[PDB]
Design a protein around this ligand. Sequence first.
Ligand code: SF4
Ligand code: SF4
Ligand code: FCO
Ligand code: FCO
Ligand code: SF3
Ligand code: SF3
Ligand code: F3S
Ligand code: F3S
Ligand SMILES: [Cl-]
Ligand SMILES: [Cl-]
Ligand SMILES: [Cl-]
Ligand SMILES: [Cl-]
Ligand SMILES: [Mg+2]
Ligand SMILES: [Mg+2]
Ligand code: NI
Ligand code: NI
Lengths: 263, 264, 581, 581
Amino acid sequence: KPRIPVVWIHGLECTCCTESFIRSAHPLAKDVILSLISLDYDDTLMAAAGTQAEEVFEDIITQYNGKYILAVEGNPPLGEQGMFCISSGRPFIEKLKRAAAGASAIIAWGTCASWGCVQAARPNPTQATPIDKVITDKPIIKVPGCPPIPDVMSAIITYMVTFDRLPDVDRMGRPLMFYGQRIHDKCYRRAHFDAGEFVQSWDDDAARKGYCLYKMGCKGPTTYNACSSTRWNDGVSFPIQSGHGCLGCAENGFWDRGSFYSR
Amino acid sequence: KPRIPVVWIHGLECTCCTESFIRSAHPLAKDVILSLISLDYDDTLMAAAGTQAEEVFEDIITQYNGKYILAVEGNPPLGEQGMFCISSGRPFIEKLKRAAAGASAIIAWGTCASWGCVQAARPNPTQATPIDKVITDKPIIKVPGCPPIPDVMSAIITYMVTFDRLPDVDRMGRPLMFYGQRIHDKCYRRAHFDAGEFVQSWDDDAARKGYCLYKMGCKGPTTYNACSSTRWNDGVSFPIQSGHGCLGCAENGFWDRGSFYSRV
Amino acid sequence: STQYETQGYTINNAGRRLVVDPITRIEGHMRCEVNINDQNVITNAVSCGTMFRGLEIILQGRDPRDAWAFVERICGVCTGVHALASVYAIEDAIGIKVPDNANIIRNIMLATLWCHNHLVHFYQLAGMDWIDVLDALKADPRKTSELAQSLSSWPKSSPGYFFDVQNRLKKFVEGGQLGIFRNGYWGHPQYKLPPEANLMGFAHYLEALDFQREIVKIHAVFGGKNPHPNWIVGGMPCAINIDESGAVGAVNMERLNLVQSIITRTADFINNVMIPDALAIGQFNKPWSEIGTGLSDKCVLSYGAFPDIANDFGEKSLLMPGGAVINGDFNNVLPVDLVDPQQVQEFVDHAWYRYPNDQVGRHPFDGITDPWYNPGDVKGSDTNIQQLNEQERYSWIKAPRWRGNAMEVGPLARTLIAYHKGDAATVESVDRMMSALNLPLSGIQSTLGRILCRAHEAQWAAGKLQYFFDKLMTNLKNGNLATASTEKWEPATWPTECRGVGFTEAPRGALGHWAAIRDGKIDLYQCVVPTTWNASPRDPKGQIGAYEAALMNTKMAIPEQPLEILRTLHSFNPCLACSTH
Amino acid sequence: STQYETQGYTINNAGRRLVVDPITRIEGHMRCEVNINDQNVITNAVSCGTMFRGLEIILQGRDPRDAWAFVERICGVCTGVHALASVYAIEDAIGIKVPDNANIIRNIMLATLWCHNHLVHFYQLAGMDWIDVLDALKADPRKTSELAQSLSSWPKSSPGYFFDVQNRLKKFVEGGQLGIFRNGYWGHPQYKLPPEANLMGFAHYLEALDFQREIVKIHAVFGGKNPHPNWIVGGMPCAINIDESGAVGAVNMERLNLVQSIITRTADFINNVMIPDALAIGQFNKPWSEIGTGLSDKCVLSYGAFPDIANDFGEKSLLMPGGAVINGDFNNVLPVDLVDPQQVQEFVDHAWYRYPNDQVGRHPFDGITDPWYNPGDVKGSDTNIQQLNEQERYSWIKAPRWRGNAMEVGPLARTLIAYHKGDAATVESVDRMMSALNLPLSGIQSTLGRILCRAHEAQWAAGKLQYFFDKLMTNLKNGNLATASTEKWEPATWPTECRGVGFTEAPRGALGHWAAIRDGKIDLYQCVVPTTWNASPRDPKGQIGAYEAALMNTKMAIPEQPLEILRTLHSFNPCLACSTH
Ligand code: SF4
Ligand code: SF4
Ligand code: FCO
Ligand code: FCO
Ligand code: SF3
Ligand code: SF3
Ligand code: F3S
Ligand code: F3S
Ligand SMILES: [Cl-]
Ligand SMILES: [Cl-]
Ligand SMILES: [Cl-]
Ligand SMILES: [Cl-]
Ligand SMILES: [Mg+2]
Ligand SMILES: [Mg+2]
Ligand code: NI
Ligand code: NI
């Protein structure tokens, strides 16, 4: 019984979203690849290189035209005629447009593909631009975070395969299931926020009791994600549980909202 | 090098604290038994029965007099001359007193050994009584809950072995490390409590969004434990996360504080 | 001394008396006494429950909605099953129907408990009756690898692995701190495994001790924690949200993915570790297919369990069949009715309780729990018992009967009922198992057979976990999310006077809770639990229960070392806190 | 065409030109071109980084305390190492000393990353260059079990396991949906393993893909998440509380017990799966001890890492040695100074950047990052590179040199430095490894040697995790809990103008960050990263970097199938996002 074809491409990026995917605990990434989808193109993992990789790309997008899902990690730069990111001797944006044209839907993994992330922070030297400003005629599901949580990535994949539909989304294209509530609306340190019980300097008596990180710059009050409920790495921790405020990493423009240590 | 001798006895109980212990994720209970302690007597796991088990009990408490730790699960009944709980044809309380006399220190596992638990709820037919009302001349560390969290039990054991001392305790004898704060002071649904966002009936729209369980009877505001931080079963869940209010199961007298569904 | 006849046995208390107190590697407190003749053969057996707490008394005057939480604490080993029986009983009394997803999740909770309890019993409780742990030190690691590989596809079988396990055991005993192995029965002539099979079994004991902790993560997802998960009257509290805002506060796709991962791992461990080990114990211990029969060729009982049609407890709905056999007539499986006052009754003429007439039995809706410690003319005294007097009262366990007959309950009982009703999966599994052993079908009616049936049922329950999970997912795909019915939650909506029965098959056998509600409060709450049946004392006719019957006629090699007695008692998986409550 | 001499090589661009774009099974974007002569031997090699983001530009004007979070996003594969280098550089500029527990935790973060990255590279990135996956379908499962058992004590070795793995692969490929295996190099004559070795290797590929997720749970405890954990200037944010009220809000005994459990499992997997597989690749591929030497017998560089004395970066403190060798003179290991303007310099005459004079090299405190895409005559256009022009600018990677010399960095470089400084453990390990392969010491200076040294380092790092954990627990037993210094957290306490250097050994080699602070803000931030060294383009003298040198002189069996090029490039573990930043 055939598995759904998937093409995964990479623009300007750090590769954190790919690394997050392979951390999945349930289902294991091994079982996603062997049993749930057909991962037919991915430069990080595939055997073929060069001309042999170009032949796989061409063959899949032609044979499965209109029927494959496109996963995108990273983003296209508009500066230097697109040659800040070069794929088979040509601008990455040309490969993005060819892959998007044949796709039935697009998953924009991470803050890079969704919004811009670190390369788009001031002064944006390469004119890095999110996917939805270039591809304007296809369904795009945004899954932001730097990177998104591993078991959130795999839950979104399993939902689509099991239910044979895209997740319902908010006004920004984020899945309601994981991005409908703020970090601060499900934070286990909220009792301390409500009581005015705050860390004032690192490793003070308040820090050693797990008090709230608002005065240390926590951006949980303005950030939508699942970190305070689902948590990270098979439920082991999240940024606030280990003593650092949220940076805001799931939100558009988080790098340029002032210092991470300003309230 | 030799491992510290441990004797584990059982009064009136349901065996939940023993089951909790074997759920430990880090260290595994296997590694605790093989490498960290010498579990020298325990009716649940030991090969010997009957006269052979009695010989083990006698030999260990004699050879290691003054040097073993006594773990107690369950409690002694004072009714019917103690014969509501019989061990080797005599009242359990006689075995408890003999084991306590030779111990360096005592760990009271669970709400039964700490306070009384379900058999002591009204009208207490057997006159079940917690360990510290019978044993008055030995250090007793209370580790309450019905049962306590598996990885709390194993963390207390590793602290004692590594640091070679008992944990520091509150005025009730509970370890500060895990019982110093309330469930409600580290609960992930506290934002909803503060906003007046409550479940009003099971499986309403509020329940499907994870709103606070105060109006459904949650006793988190008066209960000291680690469930909302450390969580249960390798961090997978806790009562509130899966949709039921806290029952108050780590607190003295929690069965007789009114219905579980009446407000704190 | 006296002698009398009952159920084809000659009960004779002349001759030497042996006492085993405490019984270890069980749950709770038990004492056993036997008499043996000059030929070292048991001619009398006495089962005594040595604890009591009084949950039936404590429940009076409580709110029915709270009952599940109290009665769950009957037992932390079979944790959850009493909560299930309780919500069933209260819903039966009030007239509440739960949504389909609540019923499916409850069936997942019960199947999870069967998998967990059957696995832990096999290794941690019964295993050391069959595996000689010290003899594992004499095994050759390469020959141990070859044996394991001949029996199973399980990956963990290298010669280096078995050498490493053997060296861990050698280091453990090197300082003379033998722990749980001290003063055991090692070297007894009834230990029949070769050294390589002892090392294989000991490695698997350790693998099972580690793995069992994973199984109960399913209870943590739906029920908050294990031991002692949470439940509600009206369904389950674990609200579901897959595709809406706030799914982070509910059972969502990531939580269901965790459940599926645990189901696959649990089936793999049971099918490739427990099942081949059970068959190997059978291959090396075939004489035990003729020892410990007891009541299993006479009288067996199942209530049935796992309703597949929500709120329907009839024969067309229950996936695990119910029925009763008496008089050894397996051609006549009889239907069971838990309301009929002439079917289930409890006697106390040989137990420590008061009745107005102790020569008759009481159905649980007429039950009485009035404790009376009165051991009578013991050897010793009332606070220093040397020998119980089995001619008078000798236990905290009441004596249940079905139409006046003494019955066996549990995995062997259920397997016989399902086989003789023609359940196709049961017939195929039993036939293949007995053919592998070259033993007749009658060989299952024995101490060895109880162990084999328990392993069969662990495999059956792991398969049913996947079936129930897929049923839940089908409902969610169709937009059916409901987990609670609340139209009769408030006490003002209840009948002023009503009564109900909740029943199921716990891991150890047939469980019932009988409840009466009056004016919003519990008026009566009576429990009859599987070990209450099996560990029962005698009745006014002198009829013996399942444990006493299974011990009769047993040969002992060494009277002072009770290995044969332990083997047969452990084969029932005794739960003494359950039996007495 | 032209020809010239450099570093003992004849660089000749006559003959057929081959292009490999994209390079796959690396991080980020790379293009390689070569020329081959009439004997199909490489006579010219061209390394090109095909991405740029500009972190050095983005960092200007940021608060120094925030810098770690930005530069961590240079790379999500070597996640954390740039944050470590950043906090080191800012602490060096301002004059901050951290508490001992913070230093110990940072060393645990770095050792965790070495274990994770070395393991994933061996299996997921480089493994398919050595194992023919499709040939595993022809293996005998019993002969596979026998091979595995002859090499290791690892438990997972049964014939049934290898049959189950083989059948999973068979079902995966049967419908034509070959996924990551489509259009591979299967059947190429340089695949030398027998079928049973290919099946063993493929089973281990799958085991490693599962297991690597567990290692990073150490980063989640101390750093909140992986990828991309959190850090602070002044120490770490993970406050410790073992025995006081509110330990539930901090790193407590339960959290430390989780860390210990992961350390033991990590060492077990590396020592019993990765180490024997690496040695087996060596046994079956000995000719690769003479291919891909490049600069490894000429010029190698380490900065050193893992300071064991808190705040002391000198030779007596660093557990991983630093030093430089040039001109093939391994008898004189030279000291490295990262402030000296005559030592580390970067050239851009062959890269896409502007300097006022491109014939000179700039030390990083004088560095300039002014992007200038100027490819000249490629065959094609500015937006269609058919053939890079290596006589002019051909890469987004700058060209680093040390005292004007082209150097190799990474596991082989570090191993050679420690061996020739006389580190006793390294000398004993290396000598025993080469003896077991029946190869001379010179055989380590090769593509095969890079792979062997990476596996040895994974083993070394797993051992160091336990050493660091024990040092932390000793401090806690002595009542020393501090994790942060805050005396100079506030900007009003800083010098008006200051500068600093942060350095370490990332998994791929020598890493440095150079920072200048003025008026409370970053004035300059320049990074030189290990793949920047190894993947470097040419300099004004025409000297070639490590990748270009290692490819020179290589025979290709089938020019259109670049398996030999991929084997040598992958042996360096290229990280192109790191190289360009
Ligand atoms: S730590 Fe951050 S998210 Fe949590 S309560 Fe405080 S401000 Fe809100
Ligand atoms: S669910 Fe319970 S513990 Fe949590 S905030 Fe509400 S009342 Fe407090
Ligand atoms: N299984 C189980 Fe416990 C007993 N007997 C119950 O019910
Ligand atoms: N390792 C690693 Fe990444 C590279 N090159 C860095 O630093
Ligand atoms: Fe996950 S590639 Fe890493 S930088 Fe922020 S999302 Fe991008
Ligand atoms: Fe854990 S034996 Fe279970 S009832 Fe409440 S603690 Fe007692
Ligand atoms: S920094 Fe990112 S990982 Fe979660 S806690 Fe804040 S959205
Ligand atoms: S019921 Fe008990 S298990 Fe924890 S959440 Fe409440 S103290
Ligand atoms: Cl791509
Ligand atoms: Cl952004
Ligand atoms: Cl005891
Ligand atoms: Cl209590
Ligand atoms: Mg009863
Ligand atoms: Mg740079
Ligand atoms: Ni039980
Ligand atoms: Ni990197």
